[PDB]
Symmetry: none
Subunit: 90 residues, 4 copies
């Protein structure tokens, strides 16, 4: 039973662009350290509607995503499976 | 506050390659092949091991093709490069 | 978003006892020994495809890797004491080595 | 063999010190419709004991990974107490 789950806490540093939904998360563990940028893909429609209707840009979220890494150069896929809105972005 | 951790289950599809940093800090590097679905994509992840007790456990006891459970802190350095610093490992089934 | 997930690696130290819920489910125990102390966990399997895989292919003493959703509910003993019963509903399993 | 557990929930108690280790409870409720699961966490690691007493307050949403142990005790008859030795914690949102 292979898997690759990713748990991310950070701020949504982009708008929700429709294509399924796509957005970026800025994760900065150390106040002085680096800021990690992850591209999130959302296929589940109930979560797509929750993002566009309730979540604003800059919101602090906790996202669980299935991770996929295609090698050809590597392409990292992060399909969101669940999200919890910690603090919205006003 | 913020964090980005990843939990991986899969088979080690490479050898344990020893390296050294410009700060003379030794670390290990290996790859994990994870395929969740038979009709799906096979995911390859590059793991970096800094913890010295885990470096010794991998080279002496773990062999190629071993089914492992690896938990690592993920970092995405800028194209982008995904870093996975192993923080804990559990050997499910070793390799023949 | 709250959860309580459990990952167990051990040997099945019991048979697969089939029950009914009112849907069906089986029950078995896993003997996990790290380093020493031996931990005894009671697993519950509701997923029908995994129920068939356990009863038909897995034998007692098999080394398995089980992921289960952990649940905890409190019961009241008659002598005023207060105990906790741990539930582990199996969600996925990988057979490492059979018995 | 191993048995680890990952919990995300809110600390529903104070940090009670014993001997040396720390003790607190986590209320995990996956659904408002459903039940609230309660887990007792034991903290042995010194750097994590200090992080709990210095930064974390009651009601904080945390993500805790702990090594699980199932202790059986005779009483009367028998009972079971689940031990969760905290190995790592990530604070999602602190309490007030």
């Amino acid at each position: 039973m292979d898997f690759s789950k990713m748990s991310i806490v950070g701020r949504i540093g982009s708008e929700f662009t429709e294509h399924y939904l796509k957005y970026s998360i800025a994760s900065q563990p150390r106040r002085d350290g680096q800021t990690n940028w992850y591209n999130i893909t959302v296929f589940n429609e109930p979560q797509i509607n929750f993002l566009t209707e309730y979540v604003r840009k800059g919101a602090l979220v906790y996202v669980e995503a299935d991770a996929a890494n295609y090698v050809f150069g590597t392409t990292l896929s992060l399909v969101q499976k669940d999200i919890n809105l910690l603090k919205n972005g006003k």
